[PDB]
Design a protein around this nucleic acid. Structure first.
Ligand SMILES: C[C@H](CCC(=O)NCCC[N+](C)(C)C[C@H](O)CS(=O)(=O)O)[C@H]1CC[C@H]2[C@@H]3[C@H](O)C[C@@H]4C[C@H](O)CC[C@]4(C)[C@H]3C[C@H](O)[C@]12C
Ligand SMILES: [Mg+2]
Lengths: 90, 476
DNA sequence: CGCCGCGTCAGACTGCACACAATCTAAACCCTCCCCTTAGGGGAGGGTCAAGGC
RNA sequence: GCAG
DNA sequence: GCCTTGACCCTCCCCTAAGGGGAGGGTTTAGATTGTGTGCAGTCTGACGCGGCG
């Protein structure tokens, strides 16, 4: 799945996929070396779904990197829970 | 014949081009078959070099863990799913592992052709195929210039018979027993030769790594490189026979691009380059005529060159396409509205912001010649109305020298310390101006004292005692 | 060796005014790199201001 | 196009 | 006056989060097409030289 087709699958812009690759959040499965074209697979959509599910909760990008790479990390989500409670009060 | 009657390069091109008769529907198929026969011949020759198929096998081992995809290494199979390629690489692997353990020598010389004609099944991509052929090329080319310098290691010693020297060199290739009979010749030349028999050693034995590196010896892969050259020069003179026979297609396309900023021959040369690409990328097994594909490539090359090199100040292909779209939209609006469209309504026929269209309209103009006759006078050109605007007027040069003199007067009407602080604080009589810290380091003084000095000196120069010479330089 | 064809080379000098050229066509993908978006933070580089002692 |  | 001295202060460059927007570059396009045409200029004469050419 080339980046255009995949960007329409997940319904997000191309620059978002470029950015998620740049920061190492969502890396394409296979980058063609001379052109540089990015090609994704189903198991990239499986990760983008998790990314978008966490990003609708307001988690900052680095928090998502930690949430996806470090397990049993409920203290960061609870911390974010307390911050969201503070912003709701505010 | 007609040779010598014209000097026009376009007449010469057409005359020389028309000596090649066109191809029929089955002529292109024959020529494409010859091209692919040449490339599979060089394939089946390089399959004699086993490290080639080991590289391709470890490339598939990279495809195992998603280092690449299958479309990057193989484009098809003749005798696309990953279903068949697993047993395909099993077919090549089983042949390689059965060819490995055999060392013999007529016993081990049919296994290699079995390897080559099982490897023929792979329709390789140009990437890997080019990689293998230039790899074996550079390998035998370095060991081959090594063989050539082994020969011309005798030319520094003497001038020698090579026809007597070729009968010896081939076949031993692990020892100097071919070099031992050179002193059995003992004509004067073969005196000098033997005294360099030491500095030939590190040459004459080091290809002995490749004697066991490829598994083959140098005369076998010598014939393999010779048949490589036969195959690739067979494909090369077949692509040339298909390029030369479609050179009228280029002209039929390139006449449609004539007055767009390039000469006719520039267009047909760029079309020729595109046609050579079209020949390189043609698949006759699609059952399509050559004209349908070659037109795409010729059109691409020609329009690309018009975009690149038809303008004096080059605009990119994105702006070239925007200008072309604007001109087409504008000639449709002119036909509809019966008048030239103003850029505001041209901004709603297109869907761009209006200042973008205004700057796009400002771009497209081409530079005027500085030799255009004005009013067609042909004794007055545009270039002799253009003034040099970078010069400074000699009144301003005289003013600058007068100001330098006045500043010298005023600064000599100060003490040496204040004049030095002002001549370093501005760049007067120096090549550079300095910060307060640099002027202070010149005087082993901290910056604020330098600031105080410079302030009091400016206060003195502001007085009506010293400033009536300087105030005259400020225009009221 | 003498002749005819062909090519090349010239063709006043100053001034005003005017004013150039005008036709001529691809699209859909992808990539990288640059600059931009908030509401100010952080810091290098470089002046400036009252104070004080020499 | 014009002036001498 | 000659200096210092700590405290301020200015401009300017880059940085923030998560991408937007654009510029400027690459690449392929598979029915089949296979020799440039201006409704061109050509319109200047005389001297000289040189080269095919009988
Ligand atoms: C500098 C010179 C004064 C002498 C002025 C006066 C007349 C001006 C030209 C004309 O206007 C025609 C044309 C207009 C285009 O727009 C730009 C190019 C042209 C050639 C102009 C160039 C330049 O500006 C000229 C020569
Ligand atoms: Mg006139």
């Amino acid at each position: 799945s080339q980046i255009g087709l995949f960007s329409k699958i997940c319904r997000v812009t191309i620059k978002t996929l470029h950015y998620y690759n740049k920061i190492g959040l969502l890396v394409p499965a296979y980058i063609n070396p001379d052109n540089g074209y990015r090609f994704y697979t189903s198991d990239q959509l499986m990760k983008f779904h998790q990314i978008a599910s966490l990003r609708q909760l307001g988690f900052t990008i680095t928090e998502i990197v930690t949430l996806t790479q470090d397990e049993n990390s409920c203290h960061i989500i609870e911390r974010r829970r307390l911050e969201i409670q503070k912003q709701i009060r505010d | 014949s007609e040779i010598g009657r014209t000097t026009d390069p376009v007449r010469m091109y057409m005359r020389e081009m028309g000596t090649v008769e066109l191809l029929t529907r089955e002529g292109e198929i024959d020529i494409a078959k010859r091209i692919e026969d040449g490339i599979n011949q060089v394939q089946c020759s390089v399959a004699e070099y086993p490290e080639a198929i080991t590289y391709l096998l470890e490339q598939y081992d990279r495809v195992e863990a998603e280092e690449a995809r299958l479309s990057d290494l193989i484009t098809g199979f003749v005798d696309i799913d990953p279903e068949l390629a697993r047993e395909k690489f099993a077919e090549l692997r089983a042949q390689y592992v059965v060819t490995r353990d055999t060392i013999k020598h007529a016993t081990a010389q049919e296994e290699i052709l079995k390897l080559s004609e099982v490897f023929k099944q792979f329709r390789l991509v140009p990437k890997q195929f080019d990689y293998l052929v230039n790899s074996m090329r550079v390998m035998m080319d370095r060991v081959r210039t090594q063989e050539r310098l082994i020969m011309k290691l005798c030319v520094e010693q003497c001038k020698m018979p090579k026809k007597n020297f070729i009968t010896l060199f081939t076949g031993n290739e692990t020892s100097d027993t071919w070099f031992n009979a050179a002193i059995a010749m003992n004509k004067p030349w073969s005196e000098k030769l033997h005294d360099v028999s030491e500095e030939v050693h590190r040459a004459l034995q080091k290809l002995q790594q490749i004697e066991e590196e490829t598994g083959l010896t140098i005369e076998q892969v010598k014939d393999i490189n010779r048949r490589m050259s036969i195959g690739e020069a067979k494909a090369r003179r077949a692509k040339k026979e298909m390029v030369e026979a479609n050179l009228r297609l280029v002209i039929s396309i390139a006449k449609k691009y004539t007055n767009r900023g390039l000469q006719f021959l520039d267009l047909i040369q760029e079309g020729n380059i595109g046609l050579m690409k079209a020949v390189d990328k043609f698949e006759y097994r699609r059952g399509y005529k050559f004209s349908t594909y070659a037109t795409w490539w010729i059109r691409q090359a020609i329009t690309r060159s018009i975009a690149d090199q038809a303008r004096t100040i080059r605009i990119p292909v994105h702006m070239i396409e925007t200008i072309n779209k604007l001109n087409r939209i504008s000639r449709q609006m002119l036909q509809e509205m019966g008048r030239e469209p103003t850029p505001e309504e041209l901004a709603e026929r297109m869907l761009m912001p209006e200042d973008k269209i205004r700057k796009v309209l400002k771009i497209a103009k081409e530079p005027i010649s500085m030799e255009t006759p004005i009013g067609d006078d042909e004794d007055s050109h545009l270039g002799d109305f253009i003034e040099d605007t970078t010069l400074e007027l000699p009144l301003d040069s005289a003013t600058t020298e007068s100001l330098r003199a006045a500043t010298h007067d005023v600064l000599a009407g100060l003490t040496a310390r204040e004049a030095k602080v002002l001549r370093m604080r501005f760049g007067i009589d120096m090549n550079t101006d300095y910060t307060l810290e640099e002027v202070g380091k010149q005087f082993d003084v901290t910056r604020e004292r330098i600031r105080q000095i410079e302030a009091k000196a400016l206060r003195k120069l502001r007085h009506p005692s010293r400033s009536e010479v300087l105030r005259s330089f400020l225009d009221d």
